[PDB]
Amino acid sequence: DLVAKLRAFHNEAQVNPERKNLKWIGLDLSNGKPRDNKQAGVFEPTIVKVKSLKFATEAAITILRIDDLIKLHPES
Amino acid sequence: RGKGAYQDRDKPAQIRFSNISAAKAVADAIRTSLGPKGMDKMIQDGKGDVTI
Amino acid sequence: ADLQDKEVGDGTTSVVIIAAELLKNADELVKQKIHPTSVISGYRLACKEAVRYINENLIVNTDELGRDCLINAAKTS
Ligand SMILES: Nc1ncnc2c1ncn2[C@@H]1O[C@H](COP(=O)(O)OP(=O)(O)O)[C@@H](O)[C@H]1O
Numbered sequence A: 001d002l003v004a005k006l007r008a009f010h011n012e013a014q015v016n017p018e019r020k021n022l023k024w025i026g027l028d029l030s031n032g033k034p035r036d037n038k039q040a041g042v043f044e045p046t047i048v049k050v051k052s053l054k055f056a057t058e059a060a061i062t063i064l065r066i067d068d069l070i071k072l073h074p075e076s
Numbered sequence B: 001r002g003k004g005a006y007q008d009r010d011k012p013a014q015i016r017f018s019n020i021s022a023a024k025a026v027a028d029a030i031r032t033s034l035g036p037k038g039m040d041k042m043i044q045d046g047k048g049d050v051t052i
Numbered sequence C: 001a002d003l004q005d006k007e008v009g010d011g012t013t014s015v016v017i018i019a020a021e022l023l024k025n026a027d028e029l030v031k032q033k034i035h036p037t038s039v040i041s042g043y044r045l046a047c048k049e050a051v052r053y054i055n056e057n058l059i060v061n062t063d064e065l066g067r068d069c070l071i072n073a074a075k076t077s
């Protein structure tokens, strides 16, 4: 339910040019309702999200690139 | 004339067949990693080293 | 996780969860006879556009907030 409400708020932001203030709506886990996280003072460095996407994508791509595994038995 | 050399020994034919079977097995093993749509392989050594 | 810890210092739990979710959903497409090269190409384009969208619509300049943003950013962490 929360993600559906959270997604609905952000959907209106990208389709209604006069409702661009809804981009800041996130999650308020204390009361379990969406909340403007820019007003609430919930901030993260931009580098944290950007580097998370770049690193996770490359790591996921690396594993996705495998389709065959050969495990040599130990020499001992 | 008719019949030629008997070729009593059968070992050379078996050796040739085994060599060909091994080569074909290797080729089929590495066929999947050919071309732009080929895919990598992950090889883990006895020491535990992992290479993709 | 170590790389994110060394090069950023935060978001270490998020990157592991996101990467596993990315791989989990990618495999579902592969099981539907979608070639992994197509899936990899889609992921690369999405990651490039996600970064561009963030830097163009979801960034807040800290100069408009003063010292309070640093406290709020620290409190969030
Ligand atoms: N006060 C808060 N209200 C709502 N969400 C928050 C709050 N503080 C942090 N979060 C969110 O919780 C998520 C988890 O962060 P956390 O797991 O603590 O960082 P890390 O992944 O480095 O351990 C963050 O993405 C952040 O957006």
Ligand SMILES: [Mg+2]
Binding pocket: C010, C011, C012, C077
């Ligand atoms: Mg954290």
